[PDB]
Amino acid sequence: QITQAISENNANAGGSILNRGEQGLVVRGVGLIRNLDDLGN
Amino acid sequence: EDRSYNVVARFIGSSRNDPEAIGNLTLTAANGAHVALAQVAHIRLAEGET
């Protein structure tokens, strides 16, 4: 369950395009693991 | 028929018009309570290469 949940917990996704007026905004976000301090969670 | 299409569940319109709205969006939790993602994921604004 641990391995399944931690392998599930790692992922990223794009938010397509948000429109404010004529301005397009690519919605980006990343919770992607980088350091080992983030591994503990 | 021979044709095929997709099926998509999407937030309606002004649901996300801007950072503030997206901050107020909700998702579940382990303790069984709706939590706004602004309480967890920090939402900011920055430009990036096209």
Spatial distance between the Cα atoms of B24 and A11, rounded to a whole number of angstroms? 22
Report d(CA A37, CA B35) in Å as an integer. Answer: 24
Angle at B14 between CA B9 and CA B17, to 5 degrees: 105
User: Where do the DSSP E strands lie in A1-41?
Assistant: 13-20, 23-29
Q: Dihedrals φ, ψ of B21, to 5°?
A: -65, -50
φ, ψ for residue A4, nearest 5 deg: -60, -45
- Look at the block and give the residue holding tokens 């993602």: B37
Q: Estimate to the nearest angstrom the gap between the alpha carbon of B19 and the chain centroid.
A: 10
Task: Tell me which chain B residues have a C-beta less than 8 angstroms from the C-beta of A19.
Answer: 17
Give the best residue of B22, B42, B44 to mutate against chain A (max A CB count within 10 A).
B22
| Resolution in angstrom units | 3.7
Paired tokens of A16: 């397509």
How many A-B residue pairs are in contact by the CB < 8 A criterion?
11
- Elucidation method: X-ray
